Amino acid sequence: STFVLSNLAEVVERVLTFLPAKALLRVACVCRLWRECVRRVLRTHRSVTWISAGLAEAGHLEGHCLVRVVAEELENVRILPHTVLYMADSERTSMETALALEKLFPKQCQVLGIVTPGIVVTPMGSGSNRPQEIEIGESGFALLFPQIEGIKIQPFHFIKDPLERHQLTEVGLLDNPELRVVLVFGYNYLQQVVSTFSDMNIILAGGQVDNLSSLTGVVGLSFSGHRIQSATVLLNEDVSDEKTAEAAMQRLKAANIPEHNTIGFMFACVGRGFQYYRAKGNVEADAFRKFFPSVPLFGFFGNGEIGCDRIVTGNDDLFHSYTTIMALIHLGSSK
Amino acid sequence: VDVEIAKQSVTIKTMLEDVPLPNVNAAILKKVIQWCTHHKDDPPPPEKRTDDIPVWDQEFLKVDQGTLFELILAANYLDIKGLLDVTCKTVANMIKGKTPEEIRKTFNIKNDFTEEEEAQVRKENQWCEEK
Question: Which among A14, A32, A71 has CB closest to B88?
Answer without folding.
Answer: A14
